[PDB]
Amino acid sequence: MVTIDSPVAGERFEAGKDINISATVKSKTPVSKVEFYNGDTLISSDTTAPYTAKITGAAVGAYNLKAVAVLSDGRRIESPVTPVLVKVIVKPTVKLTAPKSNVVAYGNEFLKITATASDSDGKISRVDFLVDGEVIGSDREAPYEYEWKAVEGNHEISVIAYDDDDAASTPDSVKIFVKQARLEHHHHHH
Ligand SMILES: [Ca+2]
Ligand SMILES: [Ca+2]
Ligand SMILES: [Ca+2]
Ligand SMILES: [Ca+2]
Ligand SMILES: [Cl-]
Numbered sequence: 001m002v003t004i005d006s007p008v009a010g011e012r013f014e015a016g017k018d019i020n021i022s023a024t025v026k027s028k029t030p031v032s033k034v035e036f037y038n039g040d041t042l043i044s045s046d047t048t049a050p051y052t053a054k055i056t057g058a059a060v061g062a063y064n065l066k067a068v069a070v071l072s073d074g075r076r077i078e079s080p081v082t083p084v085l086v087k088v089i090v091k092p093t094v095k096l097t098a099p100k101s102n103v104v105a106y107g108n109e110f111l112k113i114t115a116t117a118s119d120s121d122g123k124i125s126r127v128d129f130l131v132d133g134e135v136i137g138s139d140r141e142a143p144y145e146y147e148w149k150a151v152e153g154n155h156e157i158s159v160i161a162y163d164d165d166d167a168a169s170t171p172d173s174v175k176i177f178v179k180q181a182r183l184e185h186h187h188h189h190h
Contacts, residue, residue, distance in 0.1 A: 001079075002024070002025050005022045005024055007019060007021065012087055015060045016059075018058065019086070021054065023079065027077065029071040029073050030071065030072040031049070031069050032070045033070050034051040034069050037068065059086065060086050060087055063085070064082075089165055089167050090120050091167040093170075094117045094159050094172050096115050098112065098113065100174065101174050101176060105177075106152075107178055109181070110148065110149055113146050115129075115161075117142075117159075117161035125163055125164055126162050129146040130171070131151070132155055151178060153178060154176075157176060158171040159171065
């Protein structure tokens with residue numbers, strides 16, 4: 001059989017970048033060459049393992065990639081189509097809605113982090129929640145929320161959204177201070 005190893009079906013690329021194509025051949029007969037196609041159009045052919053091709057500066061649109069091994073006895077075997085997409089990529093945006101920088105929090109108490117996320121061209125796949133740069137949880141469904149067991153001291157809470165192209169937003173962050181659990185005092189309210 002002949003397999004296209006990369007890219008994988010359904011992969012999305014950015015307009016103007018390159019698509020590099022790799023094929024593996026399994027056959028009892030030695031391979032003369034592997035031809036690489038986009039639809040019916042020959043990209044290029046490769047007489048040597050590893051079998052590679054490259055579409056340089058790919059324009060937007062669908063690419064229907066196939067590899068064909070030409071074997072030493074004249075036979076041809078072919079991969080299935082690997083269909084990929086080249087598009088304009090537009091990163092999502094994220095906004096941290098809680099906590100605020102002046103949050104009153106204590107060590108060991110759970111503190112709810114919340115965010116909104118938007119993608120202008122596509123959709124949000126998930127929001128990741130981070131504390132001092134470390135992912136503590138993800139939420140795949142709006143509303144975006146995570147309950148963090150608070151850790152005493154100064155911490156930076158951030159969120160990063162990921163879209164359906166796996167493009168990440170820039171992070172949105174807040175700096176907070178978490179008090180020692182022993183310093184929780186009465187505070188009047190109504
Ligand atoms: Ca080669
Ligand atoms: Ca997007
Ligand atoms: Ca949720
Ligand atoms: Ca903000
Ligand atoms: Cl503490």
